[PDB]
Write a protein that binds this ligand. Structure first.
Ligand code: NAG
Ligand code: VGL
Length: 515
């Protein structure tokens, strides 16, 4: 194909504008995923209780601390309990002579009158709106899992649709569905409905990701292609910083979700001015429409020689693309061939670890340190040099040691974060930030390495299985957080162990650098 791009302009004004336009959309798309660090933050809470919260009652001389100690019992954090209150005010507990056996469990009851939440950091969150606390606490990671399952189902449905209807049509309607479903999720009347709309938003997020990447690859001349995928990968890195920047200003979840959704109406509107993939159009037997797209890009780039193209030249020079329809293949072909079984297993395990680890950790920053705005910023700011350093080492050291060292770095940081005591919040923050940086570098490595481990007709299928395994692992990410009832060390032990085991597995892969 590339000779037509050479004649039309292989990296010109059009590709520059298109790359910028698609990067910006990927930034906002990243915010949609990272949002529920802030949209679903857990403010500290207690039961509603008469002496504290009944402002219509008769006045009293006692200070707030005394009233609180008189009304809500102590809990595991050496602080007021978040799910229980005294059945009647424990005036006896005010005296300095008091002891812990002055009351018993029979003196307590659950939050019959509901909960009171701290409004100092966030004005509202879904947790505060629908009381996703105490016996309902599991519903938050469930909501996150339903979103990520939406991405899996959407990626599965995108393939057939992308090949049947085209790259740009599916991209356009995905932008529209993101705008509409995000706006609808902002105004959901009940929690099940919020889950439904987040699922339907995720279904479209998958389409935007896949077709953004594909539509760049089908319009970029090969000499510039690695750079374009690098910039595409940096879009997510800038998205983390943008999430922190937006969420620091908009402290109200409905307004925050709406604010990050509205941009996709503009993305929808400008996706009509992009061209459809010329490869796809010729492959599907529509060469006159392909000629229109090619002459349009030539007009934007300013090449005078647009007269040199004809549908005969297109059909002659793109026949080697058209011929690709001859040979279908299946995922079983990866496991039937005696040697490729081992490569497939280990490669797929690496793809899983990035998904399981990244979306396990990056969606509960509130557990990693004292300030979640700076944490969300830094898992972008560190992501940038991690990705660039990964490319450098991946060029000079080879694929195998770079992937292995990256995953082991991630795993050992996350595991060390179990041992560092809760007093040292800054060091805990730093270790978790470095862990997520290593996970990003590992994503960079495995994307490239999986494109080299396999014979060229199975290459696409191997990467496809890998990406669907990453998406499938992301679903299990948040669910593993439910193990926290046994202590916060256990979820972190799992999130740390998976990348160590897969890193040591990657050491068994064969090196693919030419020498
Ligand atoms: C709140 O205080 C008013 C004072 O008149 C009282 O009538 C009402 O029953 C109280 N309600 C609760 C739940 O304490
Ligand atoms: O590079 C990243 O951070 C990334 C890429 N695709 C999906 C999720 N995350």
């Amino acid at each position: 194909f590339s000779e037509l791009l050479d004649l039309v302009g292989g990296l010109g004004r059009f590709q520059v504008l298109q790359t910028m336009a698609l990067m910006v959309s990927i930034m906002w798309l990243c915010t949609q995923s990272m949002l529920e660090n802030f949209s679903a933050a857990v403010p500290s809470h207690r039961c509603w209780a008469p002496l504290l919260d009944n402002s219509t009652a008769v006045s009293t001389s006692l200070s707030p601390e005394a009233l609180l100690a008189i009304s809500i019992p102590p809990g595991p954090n050496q602080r007021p309990h978040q799910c229980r209150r005294f059945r009647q005010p424990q005036w006896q507990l005010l005296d300095p002579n008091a002891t812990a056996t002055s009351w018993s469990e029979a003196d307590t009851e659950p939050c019959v009158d509901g909960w009171v939440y701290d409004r100092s950091i966030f004005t509202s969150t879904i947790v505060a709106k629908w009381n996703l606390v105490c016996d309902s606490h599991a519903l938050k990671p469930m909501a996150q899992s339903i979103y990520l399952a939406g991405i899996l189902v959407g990626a599965a449905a995108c393939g057939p649709a992308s090949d049947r209807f085209g790259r740009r049509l599916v991209l356009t309607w995905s932008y529209l569905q993101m705008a509409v479903m995000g706006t609808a999720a902002a105004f959901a009347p009940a929690f099940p409905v919020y889950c439904l709309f987040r699922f339907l938003l995720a279904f479209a997020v998958a389409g935007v990701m896949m077709n953004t990447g594909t539509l760049l690859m089908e319009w970029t001349a090969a000499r510039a292609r690695p750079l374009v995928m690098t910039l595409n990968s940096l879009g997510f890195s800038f998205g983390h910083g943008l999430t922190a920047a937006v969420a620091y200003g908009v402290r109200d979840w409905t307004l925050l979700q709406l604010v990050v959704s509205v941009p996709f109406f503009l993305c929808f509107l400008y996706s009509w001015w992009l061209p459809e993939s010329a490869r796809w159009l010729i492959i599907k037997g529509k060469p006159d429409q392909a000629l229109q797209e090619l002459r349009k890009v030539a007009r934007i780039n300013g090449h005078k020689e647009a007269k040199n193209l004809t549908i005969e030249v297109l059909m002659s020079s793109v026949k080697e693309e058209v011929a690709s329809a001859k040979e279908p293949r299946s995922v079983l072909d990866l496991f039937c061939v005696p040697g490729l079984r081992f490569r497939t297993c280990i490669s797929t395990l690496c793809w899983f670890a990035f998904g399981f680890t990244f979306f396990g950790l990056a969606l509960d920053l509130q557990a990693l340190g004292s300030n979640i705005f700076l944490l969300q910023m830094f898992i972008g700011v560190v992501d940038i040099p991690a990705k660039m350093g990964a490319l450098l080492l991946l060029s000079h050291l080879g694929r195998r040691p770079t992937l292995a060292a990256s995953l082991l770095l991630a795993g050992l940081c996350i595991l060390a974060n179990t041992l560092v005591p809760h007093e040292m919040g800054a060091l805990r923050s730093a270790l978790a930030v470095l862990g997520l940086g290593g996970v990003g570098a590992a994503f960079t490595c495995i994307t490239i390495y999986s494109s080299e481990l396999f014979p060229t007709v199975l290459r696409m299928t191997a990467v496809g299985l890998g990406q669907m395994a990453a998406r499938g692992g992301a679903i299990l990410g948040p669910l593993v957080r439910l193990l926290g009832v046994h202590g916060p060390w256990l979820p972190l032990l799992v999130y740390g162990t998976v990348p160590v085991l897969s890193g040591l597995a990657a050491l068994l892969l064969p090196e693919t650098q030419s020498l």
